[PDB]
Amino acid sequence: PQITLWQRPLVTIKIGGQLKEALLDTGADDTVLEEMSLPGRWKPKMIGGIGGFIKVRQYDQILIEICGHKAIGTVLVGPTPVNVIGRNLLTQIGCTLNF
Amino acid sequence: PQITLWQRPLVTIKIGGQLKEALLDTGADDTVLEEMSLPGRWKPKMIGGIGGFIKVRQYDQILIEICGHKAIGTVLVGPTPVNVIGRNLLTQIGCTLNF
Ligand SMILES: NC(=O)c1ccc(S(=O)(=O)N(Cc2ccccc2)[C@H]2CNC[C@@H]2N(Cc2ccccc2)S(=O)(=O)c2ccc(C(N)=O)cc2)cc1
Ligand SMILES: [Cl-]
Ligand SMILES: [Cl-]
């Protein structure tokens, strides 16, 4: 698809058997989602932006489906105010910026 | 152009006659630059990042070039982790997300 930026580029995703709304965010190095359970190992990380930092759990090799595409990547889980899909997974679906 | 996301989408901008590096951020609603001088009067604005909301300075109808494409719009000034070019100017230069 070609997605306009007149509005926030929100997509639905499936992860953990769960459906979630998320922002396609080229500014985010990694995908960050609100508190949820995920399988496997993880490690603690601090991520930050305007307003400061939050602590997240970093899970790797997580299966996610996005716009009918299945991708594998890192998911940061923690108290974010906005779920975003970061570059780490946008590359896997072949997403590019164009003007 | 077409910009992939394996690396941060950093581009050169020109504002106030000076060159600066900035991140193309489709997660940012607005355009937020590091502390700098801009002409005219400003207005207060609160923007929300991952660690919370903060006040920044809002300047309207400011000329700014993004990768050589000329724009004129709202530029916010404040303690942003990096210069970000948000949807208000990305739409202006005709930028979309594609996959
Ligand atoms: N309103 C506006 O214009 C606005 C809002 C908010 C900001 S921000 O400063 O917060 N900012 C830019 C940013 C921050 C840090 C590095 C490079 C660029 C966010 C916008 N897109 C990416 C950022 N994030 C997603 C987000 C947060 C809030 C609203 C919408 C989207 S995030 O959750 O901070 C995050 C941080 C870091 C990582 C990581 N390390 O992977 C992942 C995620 C700027 C502008
Ligand atoms: Cl103020
Ligand atoms: Cl604008």
Q: What does this protein look like?
A:
The structure is a homodimer of 99-residue chains. With 99 residues, chain A is mainly beta. Chain A has one domain: Cathepsin D, subunit A, domain 1, CATH 2.40.70.10. In chain A, 4% of the residues lie in helices and 55% in strands. Chain A has one helix spanning 87-90, and strands at 2-3, 10-15, 18-24, 31-33, 43-49, 52-66, 69-77, 84-85, 96-98. In chain A, strands 2, 3, 4, 5, 6, 7 and 8 form a seven-stranded mixed β-sheet that branches. The ligand NC(=O)c1ccc(S(=O)(=O)N(Cc2ccccc2)[C@H]2CNC[C@@H]2N(Cc2ccccc2)S(=O)(=O)c2ccc(C(N)=O)cc2)cc1 sits between chains B (23, 25, 27-30, 32, 47-50, 80-82, 84, 86) and A (23, 25, 27-30, 32, 47, 49-50, 80, 82, 84, 86).
Bound molecules: the ligand NC(=O)c1ccc(S(=O)(=O)N(Cc2ccccc2)[C@H]2CNC[C@@H]2N(Cc2ccccc2)S(=O)(=O)c2ccc(C(N)=O)cc2)cc1, chloride ion
At the fourth CATH level, what is the homologous superfamily of chain A? Acid Proteases
Name the shape of chain A in a single word: globular
Work out the strand percent of chain A: over 45%
Number of strands of chain A: 9
Q: Which CATH architecture of chain A would you pick?
A: Beta Barrel
Largest interface: A-B, 41 and 40 residues
- Sheet having the most strands of chain A: 7 strands, mixed
Assembly context of the chains: homodimer
Radius of gyration of chain A: 13 Å
Subcellular location (chains A, B): Host endosome, Host multivesicular body; Virion membrane
Pfam family, one (chains A, B): RVP
Domain Peptidase A2 (chains A, B): 20-89
Membrane topology (chains A, B): Lipid-anchor
